[PDB]
Design a protein around this ligand. Structure first.
Ligand SMILES: NC(=O)C1=CN([C@@H]2O[C@H](COP(=O)(O)OP(=O)(O)OC[C@H]3O[C@@H](n4cnc5c(N)ncnc54)[C@H](O)[C@@H]3O)[C@@H](O)[C@H]2O)C=CC1
Ligand SMILES: Cc1cc2nc3c(=O)[nH]c(=O)nc-3n(C[C@H](O)[C@H](O)[C@H](O)COP(=O)(O)O)c2cc1C
Ligand code: SF4
Ligand code: SF4
Ligand code: SF4
Ligand code: SF4
Ligand code: SF4
Ligand code: FES
Ligand code: FES
Lengths: 225, 139, 120, 439, 156, 226
């Protein structure tokens, strides 16, 4: 079933008229000085035995080369990202000699049957709170949130509540309430969500201590603390 | 008219002599900024063209240069014969005070040219250099 | 201003540097190293400098015992004066605001007109 | 000066004490009768055909045919939402005719807008009026209310079954809003950047609907056509331009004003018989036929009829036909500097040549005014005039901007050459670098 | 700290009734706020954007595009003198010099007590009666430099 | 469709304008305001070519290739003298107010404006007057703002509003005081605001994350990745 990944890119023996594909532009500078603090003897450039690319400018990056994997766009007279115009058969259309990447599966001749397991209507149970996921473009990814520049962009961890549920619990916007899941009594500040349905607590998936697996789970002991 | 303009060089009498000798469908003329008539000729007629230039009334008595060129990476080859490699022969006639540049087109697999050493004895080191740096064999 | 024009204009590739920025916003080289065992003293870096920062001085006595010590750093290149060009400052021409130079305070620059101004 | 209704179809109902004419007095002296004939005896198509055969050209300044513009709306009945816009901006310097038309004859504009809305099947009408015309706005609103209460605007007008609602949209003071596509953009609550044509507003104009934009004076000409007939309108003057134009001279003349004259009357008759000529101790140097965006003409061009093709053949434009006279005491470099300052500061900023080349001409003329001109400045002005012409810029603000500049350079070059005193100097000396001395 | 009053809100809504797009009432909404408060403050842009439904960037662009929508605070009375070509022929420079001598300010600024704000403007459409000047709602024609001090005392 | 560029016959798609048709064939026409994804608006007036309606026509007419359809039977000239002088003049007009900022610009070496100034062949400055300046706004942690380098090509606002659906970027100002940005200071809350650093042909919107540790494009070692 993973047979299509062979044709995703050509192998390491692929060449454009005998030469490899350059990872850096032809005016790459500082070659005899970027490592001179370690040693004045410049070592060999690293060898890429895995792919058809080379860790040097001694290679091919022509706009008319017969390849689909373009590391960067540069043309004589076109140094901007407008240099991608030279790398396409028509501007704004497909890439020249096809786009990289192939589809693993085609559309099947026949389809599935109707899923008859229609779920019941959501009834808000007393005490238990259904966790409604709130995904964030900055924060819900595992590795992107470790970037230091995302700290100034990630929203603060706020548990979203209905006005009716917060009025029942006596909570207003801003104050902190504590909930326990698997022996972890964690406290979050409350943000009032008008559009959220009653009986649910809105939680931010992927944040610190709140896993995306918590979506759809229950939440006992939601008290103001 | 400036001297750097791309001149087709069809007013040279050597071009007319080559047309009257080898016919009008034996070679191509390349328009360059070299100031020299560039004649793309076939590999089979190279020695005949060299002998004709050597036997002119004011002949091309000197082989100025002889070297190869890798044309596999040349994107802009409009008006040129199809070639993976090429060999150019730059010749001088002092009597006419003129130059000519003969170019021979070669494929990647059939990289052999007849030797030019019999017509010009100084072609020996040039052909050795072309074999050393471009891999073109001289029969 | 760590603009990396000398490093790319160097035909030998013996200039390495990295741009850093101060709190006001001005650019400077965080480091600047030249491999003088590799340099050919051709003057293309001085020719390509748009700030006249890098210069080739009349000095030839640079003999060394170890060529690792021929890699000069920023503490060995930065001098305490203007050099051959005495009264040129690039930041008096630039339109970028730094300390001691607000917007419109450069040469041949008008004052910034706000879009909320009452004048037509 | 006496104005019979025959030769003065617009200004004959003006009052001697300069008060606005309201509905009872307007209808007393043959008011809303052309609208009655239009809405009770003629189909919209034959009204458009009558305006087309009348030869009524656009009075905004370009002289386009009004009937041909009206015929270009789509013929299918699927788009019943249609807009008619009255360009009451009149932001051009030297132009004051729409102020006279709407400040004292608002019901004429209302009746003409009603006729043109019935002809175009326009369900809504907007008078896009500049913010500086305040008493004109009050008079227009009061006339609209009077026509609405007296069965002339609203629902089921004159028993025909035609619904038309008229609004007054007071502008916010920008010159570019008078351009028809920029007028449409400003009517939609946007910044008044003009639009590229094609598509023309007749097919997709205001809010994507068919929209016809016409000047005040065109809609004031239309009820006379629909009331007194078409053959009467073609027999006003023996000229290729049918009808009467509001013409007049302004600027240091004895009697500056506005008079309704037939096409073909020469500019000298306006200057001496109507404007009275130049003032005491003042000589005549130049004149501009159609406001601030027209080529300057000389004294030899004064014996020229005021038609579009006659002024156009002599290297100028008829424009709005409101000429402005320049005496010998006026330095022409200062005058062109003022003109270019207006044209540069009233740019919309959409397209590069006007936005970034009109201030260059402004600064060159400021240098020439103070005597600090440098060699190459007049050649730079000429190149700017050549490269800001029709088709180079997105709209026609910049060709009309640069027409007075090239006309002044053509006719009064010696005044521009007199402002060049210092040698050319763009660089300053950098110590340590020998400069490249180009020859 | 900005909040639309009631009458401004029904005025903006009644102007939204006139058009088929709520965006088309933005210029008149800005003019209503300017008529009420003398100028358009910073919070007025977002309040008008909320009451029309359009983004505040478009409201700011409209407010900064038009010259008569004042986005900076002005004085009690806005003097607007025409500087176009016909009034340049008729001598607007003397009128401007008289205004500068009286108010002791440059064109574009406001006096220290906030009484008059002096502004150049384009053609007022009264070129046959030049030079002209637009004080708040009143146009004044046939101006002379000695009529400026006798004419500036009717606006306290 | 069949067009004639400089006497050479070309087969193009008739539903495209002349700019994308000619750029697809490898013909270099300078342009700023046109983008393949956004469309044609005719703002920068940089894409001027001389159009002829007949094969035997000498005068012609300077038109915008981005606003002119690539219909069958159009004879356009790109390297005609009048068209080249007009494009050089447009570059010169954009260069009258542009700051002397290329060494301290993150877009240097990756700049479309630099490439088009070099392509038109304008390298001599005859403008001797002052250059307009602008204050800068804080656009958040991602996008650095430098308003002096703007050429008023309207790509940013067209992308951000008509494509990305953002609501806090716009055009403000007037005749030549056009400002492009937010009504106040604050973070661009569109989830696609990062494309402004590549949409903008100048160094107005720049990558602040890259500006922290900045190197030029020729110094970058690139790879294709996912
Ligand atoms: N305040 C004023 O009265 C001012 C008047 N103007 C005048 O405006 C003129 C420029 O006006 P523009 O609209 O820019 O130029 P234009 O000549 O392209 O358009 C004028 C009118 O003709 C119509 N038109 C022309 N060709 C058409 C076609 N093929 N199909 C459909 N309709 C067509 C347009 O719809 C428009 O209503 C100037 O020459 C000047 O005389 C200029 C400035 C101020
Ligand atoms: C910069 C510019 C400003 C214009 N201003 C006005 C104006 O203020 N009033 C007007 O009627 N036409 C003005 N026009 C002309 C309009 O484009 C158009 O001709 C008008 O809306 C209707 O013209 P018409 O009388 O032929 O119907 C202007 C044109 C341009 C290019
Ligand atoms: S002088 Fe030395 S460092 Fe400078 S460009 Fe030449 S080789 Fe490089
Ligand atoms: S020395 Fe000059 S050329 Fe090199 S990075 Fe610094 S400013 Fe640029
Ligand atoms: S010429 Fe261009 S910038 Fe000037 S007003 Fe017209 S569209 Fe706007
Ligand atoms: S935006 Fe481009 S032209 Fe402008 S300063 Fe930056 S690199 Fe130079
Ligand atoms: S900020 Fe950039 S994208 Fe926006 S108009 Fe200016 S140059 Fe164009
Ligand atoms: S020029 Fe001043 S009112 Fe018209
Ligand atoms: S690319 Fe055509 S005008 Fe901008």
């Amino acid at each position: 079933e993973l047979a299509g990944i062979k044709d995703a890119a050509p192998d390491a023996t692929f060449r454009i008229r005998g030469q490899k594909l350059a990872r850096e532009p032809h005016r790459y500078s500082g070659r005899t000085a970027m490592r001179a603090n370690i040693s004045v003897h410049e070592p060999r450039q690293p060898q890429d035995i895995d792919t058809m690319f080379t860790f040097s400018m001694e290679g091919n990056n022509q706009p008319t080369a017969h390849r689909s994997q373009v590391p960067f766009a540069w043309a004589p007279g076109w140094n901007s990202p407008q240099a991608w115009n030279k790398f396409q058969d028509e501007v704004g259309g497909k890439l020249r000699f096809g786009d990289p990447g192939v589809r693993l599966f085609e559309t099947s001749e026949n389809g599935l049957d109707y899923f008859t397991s229609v779920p019941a209507r959501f009834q808000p149970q007393d005490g238990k709170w259904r966790i409604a996921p709130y995904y964030h473009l900055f924060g819900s990814d595992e590795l992107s949130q470790r970037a230091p520049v995302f700290q100034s962009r990630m929203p603060q961890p706020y548990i979203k509540l209905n006005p009716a549920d917060a009025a029942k619990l006596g909570v207003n916007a801003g104050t902190r309430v504590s909930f326990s899941y698997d022996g972890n009594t964690v406290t979050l500040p409350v943000e009032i969500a008008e559009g959220l349905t009653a009986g649910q607590v809105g939680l931010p998936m992927g944040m610190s201590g709140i896993a995306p697996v918590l979506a759809g789970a229950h939440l006992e002991d939601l008290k103001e603390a | 008219e400036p001297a750097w303009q791309t001149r087709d060089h069809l007013d040279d009498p050597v071009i007319g002599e080559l047309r009257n000798r080898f016919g009008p469908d034996a070679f191509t003329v390349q328009a360059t900024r070299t100031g020299v008539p560039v004649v793309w000729i076939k590999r089979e007629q190279l020695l005949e063209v060299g002998d004709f230039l050597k036997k002119l009334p004011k002949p091309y008595v000197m082989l100025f240069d002889l070297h190869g060129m890798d044309e596999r990476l040349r994107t802009h080859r409009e008006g040129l014969p199809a070639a993976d490699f090429s060999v150019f022969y730059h010749l001088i006639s002092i009597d006419r005070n003129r130059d000519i540049m003969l170019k021979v087109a070669l494929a990647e697999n059939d990289l052999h040219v007849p030797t030019f050493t019999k017509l010009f004895p100084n072609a020996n080191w040039y052909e050795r250099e072309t074999w050393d740096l471009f891999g073109i064999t001289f029969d | 201003v760590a603009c990396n024009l000398c490093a790319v204009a160097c035909p030998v590739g013996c200039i390495s540097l990295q741009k850093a920025e101060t709190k006001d916003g001005r650019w400077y080289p965080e480091f600047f190293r030249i491999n003088f065992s590799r340099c050919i003293f051709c003057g293309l870096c001085e020719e390509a400098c748009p700030t006249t920062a890098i210069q080739l001085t009349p000095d030839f006595e640079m003999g060394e015992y170890k060529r690792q010590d021929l890699v000069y750093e920023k503490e060995d290149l930065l001098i305490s004066g203007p050099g051959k060009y005495p009264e040129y400052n690039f930041y008096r021409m630039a339109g970028m605001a730094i300390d001691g130079k607000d917007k419109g305070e450069a040469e041949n620059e008008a004052k910034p007109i706000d879009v909320k101004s009452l004048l037509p | 000066i006496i104005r019979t209704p025959e030769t003065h179809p617009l200004t004959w109902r003006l009052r001697d004490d300069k008060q606005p004419v309201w509905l009872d007095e307007y209808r007393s002296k043959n008011g809303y009768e052309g609208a009655r004939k239009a809405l009770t005896g003629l189909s919209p198509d034959e009204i458009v055909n009558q305006v087309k055969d009348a030869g009524l050209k656009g009075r905004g300044g370009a002289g386009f045919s009004t009937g041909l513009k009206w015929s270009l709306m789509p013929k299918d009945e699927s788009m019943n939402i249609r807009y008619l816009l009255c360009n009451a901006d009149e932001m051009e310097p030297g132009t004051y005719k729409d102020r006279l038309l709407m400040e004292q004859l608002p019901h004429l504009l209302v009746e003409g807008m009603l006729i043109s809305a019935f002809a175009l099947k326009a369900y809504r009408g907007y008078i896009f009026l500049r913010g500086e015309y305040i008493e004109a706005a009050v008079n227009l609103r009061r006339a609209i209310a009077e026509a609405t209460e007296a069965g002339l605007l609203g629902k089921n007008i004159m028993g025909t079954g035609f619904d038309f609602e008229l609004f007054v949209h007071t502008g916010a003071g920008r010159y570019i809003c008078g351009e028809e596509t920029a007028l449409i953009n400003s009517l939609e609550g946007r910044r008044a950047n003009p639009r590229s044509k094609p598509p023309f507003p007749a097919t997709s104009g205001a809010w994507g609907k068919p929209t016809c934009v016409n000047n005040v004076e065109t809609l004031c000409n239309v009820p006379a056509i629909l009331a007194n007939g078409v053959e009467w309108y073609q027999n006003i003057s023996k000229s290729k331009d049918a009808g009467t134009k509001l013409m007049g001279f302004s600027g240091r003349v004895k009697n500056p004003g506005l008079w309704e004259l037939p096409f073909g009357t020469t500019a000298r008759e306006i200057l001496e018989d109507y404007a009275g000529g130049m003032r005491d101790g003042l000589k005549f140097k130049a004149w501009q036929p159609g406001g601030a965006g027209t080529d300057f003409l000389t004294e030899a061009h004064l014996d020229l009829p005021m038609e579009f093709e006659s002024i156009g053949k002599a290297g100028s434009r008829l424009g709005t036909a409101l000429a402005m006279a320049v005496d010998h005491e006026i330095n022409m470099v200062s005058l062109v500097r003022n003109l270019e300052e207006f044209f540069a500061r009233e740019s919309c900023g959409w397209c590069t040549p006007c936005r970034d080349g009109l201030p260059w001409s402004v600064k060159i003329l400021r240098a020439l005014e103070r005597g600090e001109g440098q060699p190459g400045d007049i050649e730079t002005l000429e190149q700017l005039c050549r490269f800001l012409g029709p088709g180079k810029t997105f709209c026609a603000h910049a060709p009309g901007a640069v027409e007075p500049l090239q006309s002044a350079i053509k006719y009064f070059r010696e005044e521009f050459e007199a402002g060049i005193k210092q040698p050319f100097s763009n660089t300053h000396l950098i110590n340590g670098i020998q400069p490249n001395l180009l020859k | 700290a900005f909040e639309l009053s009631a009458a401004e809100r029904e005025a903006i809504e009644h102007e939204m009734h006139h058009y088929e797009d709520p965006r088309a009432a933005s210029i008149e909404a800005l003019k209503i706020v300017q008529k009420q408060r003398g100028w358009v403050p910073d919070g007025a842009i977002h309040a008008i954007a909320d009451v029309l439904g359009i983004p505040a960037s478009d409201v700011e662009g409209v407010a900064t595009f038009y010259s008569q929508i004042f986005r900076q605070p002005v004085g009690r009375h806005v003097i607007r003198y025409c500087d176009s070509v016909v009034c340049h022929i008729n001598g607007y420079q003397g009128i401007q010099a008289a205004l500068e001598k009286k108010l002791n300010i440059k064109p574009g600024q406001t006096t220290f007590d906030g009484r008059f704000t002096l502004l150049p403007t384009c053609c007022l459409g009264n070129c046959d009666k030049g030079p002209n000047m637009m004080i708040d709602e009143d146009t004044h024609a046939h101006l002379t430099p000695e009529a400026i001090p006798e004419l500036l005392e009717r606006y306290k | 469709a069949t067009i004639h560029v400089d006497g050479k016959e070309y087969e193009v798609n008739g539903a495209d304008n002349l700019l994308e048709a000619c750029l697809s064939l490898g013909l270099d026409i300078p342009y700023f305001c046109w983008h393949p994804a956004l469309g044609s608006v005719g703002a920068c007036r940089q894409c001027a070519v001389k159009q002829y309606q007949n094969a035997e026509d000498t005068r012609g007419r300077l038109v915008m290739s981005c606003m002119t359809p690539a219909s069958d039977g159009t004879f356009i000239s790109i390297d005609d003298e009048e068209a080249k002088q007009f494009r050089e003049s447009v570059v010169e007009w954009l260069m009258t107010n542009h700051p002397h900022d290329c060494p301290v610009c993150e877009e240097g070496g990756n700049c479309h404006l630099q490439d088009m100034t070099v392509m038109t062949g304008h390298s001599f400055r005859r403008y001797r007057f002052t250059k307009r300046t602008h204050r800068n706004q804080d656009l958040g942690p991602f996008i650095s703002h430098e308003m002096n380098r703007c050429i008023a090509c309207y790509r940013c606002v067209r992308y951000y509003k008509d494509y990305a659906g953002g609501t806090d970027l716009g055009v403000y100002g007037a005749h030549d005081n056009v400002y492009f940005g937010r009504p106040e200071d604050g973070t661009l809350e569109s989830e696609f605001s990062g494309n402004l650093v590549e949409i903008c042909p100048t160094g107005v919107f720049t990558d602040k994350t890259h500006s922290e540790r900045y190197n030029r494009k020729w110094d970058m070692q690139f790879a294709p990745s996912i």
